[PDB]
Scaffold this active site. Structure first.
Site, mmCIF file in Angstrom:
data_model
loop_
_atom_site.group_PDB
_atom_site.id
_atom_site.type_symbol
_atom_site.label_atom_id
_atom_site.label_comp_id
_atom_site.label_asym_id
_atom_site.label_seq_id
_atom_site.Cartn_x
_atom_site.Cartn_y
_atom_site.Cartn_z
ATOM 1 N N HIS A 1 -6.008 -2.037 -12.349
ATOM 2 C CA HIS A 1 -5.685 -1.672 -10.993
ATOM 3 C C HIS A 1 -4.750 -2.727 -10.424
ATOM 4 O O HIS A 1 -5.159 -3.895 -10.305
ATOM 5 C CB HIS A 1 -6.893 -1.579 -10.078
ATOM 6 C CG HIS A 1 -6.488 -1.294 -8.683
ATOM 7 N ND1 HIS A 1 -5.880 -0.110 -8.339
ATOM 8 C CD2 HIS A 1 -6.431 -2.083 -7.585
ATOM 9 C CE1 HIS A 1 -5.513 -0.159 -7.070
ATOM 10 N NE2 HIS A 1 -5.850 -1.341 -6.587
ATOM 11 N N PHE B 1 0.829 -1.200 0.000
ATOM 12 C CA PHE B 1 0.000 0.000 0.000
ATOM 13 C C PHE B 1 0.865 1.252 0.000
ATOM 14 O O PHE B 1 1.939 1.295 0.622
ATOM 15 C CB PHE B 1 -0.924 0.060 1.222
ATOM 16 C CG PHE B 1 -1.905 -1.078 1.362
ATOM 17 C CD1 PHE B 1 -2.146 -1.975 0.335
ATOM 18 C CD2 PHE B 1 -2.610 -1.220 2.558
ATOM 19 C CE1 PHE B 1 -3.093 -2.997 0.488
ATOM 20 C CE2 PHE B 1 -3.563 -2.241 2.704
ATOM 21 C CZ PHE B 1 -3.779 -3.119 1.688
HETATM 22 C C1 LIG Z 1 0.939 -10.790 -1.903
HETATM 23 C C2 LIG Z 1 1.615 -11.295 -3.179
HETATM 24 C C3 LIG Z 1 2.454 -10.169 -3.775
HETATM 25 C C4 LIG Z 1 2.552 -12.463 -2.828
HETATM 26 O O1 LIG Z 1 3.212 -12.875 -4.004
HETATM 27 P P1 LIG Z 1 2.989 -14.384 -4.626
HETATM 28 O O2 LIG Z 1 1.600 -14.912 -4.385
HETATM 29 O O3 LIG Z 1 3.397 -14.345 -6.087
HETATM 30 O O4 LIG Z 1 4.098 -15.346 -3.885
HETATM 31 P P2 LIG Z 1 3.772 -16.460 -2.719
HETATM 32 O O5 LIG Z 1 2.677 -17.395 -3.140
HETATM 33 O O6 LIG Z 1 5.053 -17.208 -2.460
HETATM 34 O O7 LIG Z 1 3.288 -15.667 -1.351
HETATM 35 C C5 LIG Z 1 4.251 -15.128 -0.488
HETATM 36 C C6 LIG Z 1 3.747 -15.186 0.903
HETATM 37 O O8 LIG Z 1 2.653 -14.150 1.062
HETATM 38 C C7 LIG Z 1 1.514 -14.897 1.737
HETATM 39 N N1 LIG Z 1 0.294 -14.281 1.370
HETATM 40 C C8 LIG Z 1 -0.030 -14.006 0.111
HETATM 41 N N2 LIG Z 1 -1.277 -13.421 0.113
HETATM 42 C C9 LIG Z 1 -1.657 -13.364 1.519
HETATM 43 C C10 LIG Z 1 -2.746 -12.892 2.138
HETATM 44 N N3 LIG Z 1 -3.843 -12.294 1.407
HETATM 45 N N4 LIG Z 1 -2.821 -12.981 3.451
HETATM 46 C C11 LIG Z 1 -1.805 -13.538 4.182
HETATM 47 N N5 LIG Z 1 -0.678 -14.015 3.558
HETATM 48 C C12 LIG Z 1 -0.627 -13.918 2.250
HETATM 49 C C13 LIG Z 1 1.681 -16.289 1.261
HETATM 50 O O9 LIG Z 1 1.032 -17.235 2.150
HETATM 51 C C14 LIG Z 1 3.125 -16.487 1.240
HETATM 52 O O10 LIG Z 1 3.562 -16.848 2.586
HETATM 53 P P3 LIG Z 1 4.910 -17.812 2.771
HETATM 54 O O11 LIG Z 1 6.060 -17.250 1.970
HETATM 55 O O12 LIG Z 1 5.233 -17.837 4.250
HETATM 56 O O13 LIG Z 1 4.529 -19.192 2.283
HETATM 57 C C15 LIG Z 1 0.631 -11.769 -4.241
HETATM 58 O O14 LIG Z 1 -0.050 -12.933 -3.810
HETATM 59 C C16 LIG Z 1 -0.441 -10.737 -4.581
HETATM 60 O O15 LIG Z 1 -0.232 -9.847 -5.350
HETATM 61 N N6 LIG Z 1 -1.714 -10.897 -3.948
HETATM 62 C C17 LIG Z 1 -2.801 -9.984 -4.227
HETATM 63 C C18 LIG Z 1 -2.863 -8.999 -3.072
HETATM 64 C C19 LIG Z 1 -4.249 -8.409 -2.923
HETATM 65 O O16 LIG Z 1 -5.208 -9.077 -2.691
HETATM 66 N N7 LIG Z 1 -4.322 -6.984 -3.077
HETATM 67 C C20 LIG Z 1 -5.560 -6.247 -2.945
HETATM 68 C C21 LIG Z 1 -5.142 -5.110 -2.024
HETATM 69 N N8 LIG Z 1 -6.231 -4.194 -1.830
HETATM 70 C C22 LIG Z 1 -6.667 -3.894 -0.496
HETATM 71 O O17 LIG Z 1 -6.141 -4.411 0.435
HETATM 72 C C23 LIG Z 1 -7.817 -2.909 -0.325
HETATM 73 C C24 LIG Z 1 -7.912 -2.432 1.111
HETATM 74 C C25 LIG Z 1 -6.858 -1.347 1.373
HETATM 75 C C26 LIG Z 1 -7.221 -0.007 0.715
HETATM 76 O O18 LIG Z 1 -8.349 0.349 0.656
HETATM 77 C C27 LIG Z 1 -6.144 0.923 0.167
HETATM 78 C C28 LIG Z 1 -6.362 2.424 0.167
HETATM 79 C C29 LIG Z 1 -5.433 3.251 -0.284
HETATM 80 C C30 LIG Z 1 -4.128 2.703 -0.829
HETATM 81 C C31 LIG Z 1 -3.932 1.396 -0.832
HETATM 82 C C32 LIG Z 1 -5.000 0.448 -0.303
#
Ligand SMILES: CC(C)(COP(=O)(O)OP(=O)(O)OC[C@H]1O[C@@H](n2cnc3c(N)ncnc32)[C@H](O)[C@@H]1OP(=O)(O)O)[C@@H](O)C(=O)NCCC(=O)NCCNC(=O)CCCC(=O)c1ccccc1
Ligand SMILES: CC(C)(COP(=O)(O)OP(=O)(O)OC[C@H]1O[C@@H](n2cnc3c(N)ncnc32)[C@H](O)[C@@H]1OP(=O)(O)O)[C@@H](O)C(=O)NCCC(=O)NCCNC(=O)CCCC(=O)c1ccccc1
Lengths: 379, 378
Positions: free
Chosen positions: B291, B201
């Site tokens: 986005h 963020f």
């Molecule tokens: C996260 C990456 C890059 C990971 O990169 P990748 O997936 O490629 O790599 P990866 O699979 O190895 O994951 C690596 C490790 O992150 C862990 N992990 C993964 N996701 C997790 C999760 N959700 N919770 C917990 N742990 C998680 C996983 O579990 C692993 O943990 P470990 O490494 O320990 O195994 C990727 O997935 C990705 O871009 N995702 C999509 C993210 C998403 O939804 N954006 C929507 C955001 N909009 C809001 O918030 C709106 C509300 C705020 C707002 O209004 C606002 C206002 C003003 C300005 C800004 C905002």
């Protein structure tokens, strides 16, 4: 072909608080019976309120379980939001179902949703929750108006007008819903404004269906939304302030708000009607829905526009029977006007008159006006 | 005579946080250097973030003065709001003045204002504060969009389109501004979602001017806003949640958000373009502003639409140089695309192509799309 209001429904919480009983209730449940000084002041305000009863979601049992709600300045936003984020869409649903019944079309014909509330905020918002509750199309086009304030009953009609007129065939459901649990505060002589809100603020929801090109024999217009204007009254930024705080939604109301309204009403009426026909006098020719932010605001509009006795009857009736419910209030007034016009056998929904205005007044101070035409009474 | 984007301006806070340095900064200033397990996870998230740097209003001195901001769950909304209710309109003002400069018309010609933020809430609102800062006409017609979320960069274009097209002569100033101080939270192994927000963020503001019927030789369009569609992706209500609480704006993010976007993108793209053309679309014939809620969301759009290498370059460039700034981000991407198109000598503001799309993605999950046409560079 201008946007028309095709239906109006309204709803309120079930608990009625008669004003004659409210001082006793307020001072008992907030443990303030020793504050006879504030009780005297509150009695005077209630006597001047021109509010006979109000409907409120909040109960004594809720205050007993969450005494921080009546402890001035104590942290309480979370408990208030946990209530209002649920109750606001629910109350909106009740009003919406009544509007949809009057309209007489399938819910699948609703293309747009405007939800408006100053009582809560959440993501996803009330608009999303109402879609779930009603089964609206997942692809409805949404406008979620949070924390605009008491001008927004006119604002949402302006927004609906543009959406309905620029999107052919569109049918806009407009829902305004307020639950004042978030605004309830305890009593301190350091913040006397709370005595005014404690006397006047109330809960309610309205729903309005807006569309251009009514379908013959199914749809029936009630009013036409002709022209709108929004303006800031000079030198009145302190008039109404609401801060979203750890203690809830804290509000400050200047005693000069009625004077600001009266000092600007001829001007803002004249500039609004410049968009229509250039009307500049003889305001008694119109029908009116004036947001009754308090009785002194209504009195100022009556005096400075030279309105005759009874012209603001529908506005005063709603204030008396419901209090100031925020944005929905002007829609309750339009519905009351339509109902009384039926009762009296008037030729139109606007007390037999052709042209009228909705006046919303809120923070800024901001005034939004919507010029309406009435419609013939049928179905 | 559809509504056109006539100008785009952007702004960010002055403090730059390079991602290489952010884990050290975050764990030091929040007093969490003992949490080696969380540090390792945060390092992995940052390495996958595809974000090289971010601009943030928040500073270490602010955290030192207000340690409840980094103490997970402590009451801190009041201090956060006291900052953001000032800083959001100020940053919006900077972007607006840039858009107004490009547009080239007097401020008095603006008839409509849309202000959008998910970073604060107050009455009077940011729209009122911006009117004061800029000297807009006190009778501007206002729409104040609070706490919509990450789809709103498309939504505000849809709203501006209707206002500009239904009001002859109207000129709509659209301002989206975010200051993520309200979303900053400390670290706990019970709320790992915070590690994602801490990595992605960021702060920024955009301003767009929208009008129909641009004045020949005075105004010039950059994009045309043709048609728009908003939809809720099925069975995804838990995807993004933000609650406005005593501890600030608390958020939860499901790890299934990328898969939900990928599972629906063909459908939402098809149904959007059905509003403009009866023929089926070749997705690689379009230009895109997506986005970048995170890199995985961008990857899902690329994968399921079969987009060729480089198609999402502008989107990925903004994510890299600015992070996820919320609703303004898609406007930064349109500005980058226009800038790069000038640099490369393209025939249009949309990478030399005619048709394009803005894809906003936020709570619901909700997707709003805006179909655009490019314009000649003039
Ligand atoms: C996260 C990456 C890059 C990971 O990169 P990748 O997936 O490629 O790599 P990866 O699979 O190895 O994951 C690596 C490790 O992150 C862990 N992990 C993964 N996701 C997790 C999760 N959700 N919770 C917990 N742990 C998680 C996983 O579990 C692993 O943990 P470990 O490494 O320990 O195994 C990727 O997935 C990705 O871009 N995702 C999509 C993210 C998403 O939804 N954006 C929507 C955001 N909009 C809001 O918030 C709106 C509300 C705020 C707002 O209004 C606002 C206002 C003003 C300005 C800004 C905002
Ligand atoms: C008050 C009456 C009836 C008094 O009746 P009158 O004026 O005729 O009689 P009066 O002069 O004798 O006054 C009797 C004693 O009340 C004292 N007093 C007077 N005004 C005071 C003040 N502001 N502060 C402190 N004390 C005051 C005075 O000082 C005198 O005190 P004393 O008796 O001790 O001398 C009259 O004035 C009147 O209708 N006013 C206008 C009221 C006004 O602005 N409504 C705008 C409200 N909108 C909001 O809040 C927006 C934020 C909430 C919101 O979003 C929301 C959301 C959802 C649902 C609802 C709301």
């Amino acid at each position: 072909q201008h946007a028309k209001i095709l239906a109006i429904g309204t709803a309120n919480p079930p608990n009625v608080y008669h004003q004659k009983d409210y001082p006793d209730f307020l001072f008992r449940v907030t443990k303030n019976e020793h504050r006879t000084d504030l009780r005297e002041k509150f009695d005077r305000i209630c006597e001047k309120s021109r509010t006979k009863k109000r409907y409120l979601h909040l109960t004594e049992e809720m205050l007993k379980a969450n005494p921080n709600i009546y402890t001035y300045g104590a942290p309480s936003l979370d408990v208030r939001q946990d209530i209002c984020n649920i109750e606001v869409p629910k109350l909106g649903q009740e009003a919406a179902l009544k509007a949809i019944k009057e309209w007489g079309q399938p819910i699948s014909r609703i293309t747009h949703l405007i939800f408006c509330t100053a009582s809560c905020v959440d993501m996803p918002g009330c608009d999303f929750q109402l879609i779930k509750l009603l089964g609206l199309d997942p692809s409805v086009t949404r406008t979620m108006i949070y924390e605009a304030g008491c001008y927004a009953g006119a604002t949402v009609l302006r927004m609906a007008k543009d959406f309905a007129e620029n999107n052919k065939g569109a049918r806009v459901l407009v829902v305004c819903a307020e639950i004042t649990t978030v605004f309830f505060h305890g009593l301190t002589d350091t913040h006397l404004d709370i005595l005014v809100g404690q006397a006047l603020f109330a809960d309610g929801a309205s729903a309005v269906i807006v569309g251009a090109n009514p379908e013959p024999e199914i749809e029936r217009p009630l009013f036409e939304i002709v022209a709108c204007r929004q303006t800031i009254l000079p030198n009145s930024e302190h008039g109404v302030v609401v801060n979203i705080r750890e203690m809830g939604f804290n509000y400050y109301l200047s005693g000069d708000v009625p004077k600001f309204v009266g000092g600007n009403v001829v001007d803002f009426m004249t500039k609004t009607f410049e968009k229509v026909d250039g009307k500049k006098k003889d305001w008694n020719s119109l029908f009116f829905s004036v947001h009754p932010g308090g009785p002194a605001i209504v009195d100022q509009v009556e005096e400075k526009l030279g309105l005759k006795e009874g012209k603001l009857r529908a506005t005063r009736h709603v204030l008396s029977e419901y209090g100031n419910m925020g944005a929905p209030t002007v829609h309750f007034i339009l519905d009351e006007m339509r109902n009384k016009s039926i009762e009296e056998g008037k030729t139109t929904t606007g007390e037999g008159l052709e042209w009228g205005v909705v006046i919303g007044i809120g923070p800024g101070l901001t005034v939004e006006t919507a010029v309406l035409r009435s419609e013939s009474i049928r179905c």
